[PDB]
Amino acid sequence: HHHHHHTGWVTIDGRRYYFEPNTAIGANGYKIIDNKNFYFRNGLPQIGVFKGPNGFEYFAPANTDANNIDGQAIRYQNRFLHLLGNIYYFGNNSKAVTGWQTINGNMYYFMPDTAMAAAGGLFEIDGVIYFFGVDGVKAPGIY
């Protein structure tokens, strides 16, 4: 295997990994550890927007809000997140919105599986084709 047996939090090559105490293999999926939320792949906290058991959270780079560490979910309220070329909108509960949304008078569609805005072309949603701008805003009309 790629890793030897470790348990709990360990530092490897400049990153903190979490290994399951009962199996000594890297953690996978969402976990709250000491009141900090992470989304793991093979022990390594992932950085980005991922779906946890109460919706999409922003698992942020270190020092984004309240001195969070790499991959720790952060408070992120009532604003857009423009990450890696993709567009999200976060509500008052610090979760990314999904489906049809009206924001500042404009209509968006946030993909249910990724929370990313449909953007930059024609998208088929529930049998109907719509046009979305590069900014994720739905144009007038049917296509």
Epitope: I47, G48, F80, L84, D135
Partner: nanobody, 123 residues
């Protein structure tokens, strides 16, 4: 703890060139768009340029299109503004910015702002 620091400003003659650098520290910006804004005397802050996380996709104010070029080096956590064919109209305090939280990158809503560097162009 996070700082954006502009350098490369100052005086220049019309038709000439300047290169601004904005060095970021305290947090990695490789996932965020980065931008330049400017504030002319008496007027409000205005959009100049913005570049995507990798640097592949760029947007420019109509005023500066063709003359100004935005680029970035993520290994250095730095964004640049190459200012060619300078005009007296370009005279302004220039600000670098990162991580927009408004609807689009043109809007003056960014999570991090530089201190600003004075640029003066003479006729």
């Amino acid at each position: 703890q996070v700082q954006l620091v502009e350098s490369g400003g100052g005086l220049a003659q019309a038709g000439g060139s300047l290169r601004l650098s904005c060095a970021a520290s305290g947090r990695t910006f490789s996932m965020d768009p980065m931008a330049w804004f400017r504030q002319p005397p008496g007027k409000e802050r205005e959009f100049v340029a913005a570049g995507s996380s990798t640097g592949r996709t760029t947007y420019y104010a109509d005023s500066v299109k063709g003359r100004f070029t935005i680029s970035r080096d993520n290994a250095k956590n730095t964004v640049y503004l190459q200012m060619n064919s300078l005009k007296p109209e370009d005279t302004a305090v220039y600000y670098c910015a990162a991580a927009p939280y408004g609807a689009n990158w043109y809007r003056d809503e960014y999570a991090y702002w530089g201190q600003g560097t004075q640029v003066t162009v003479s006729s």
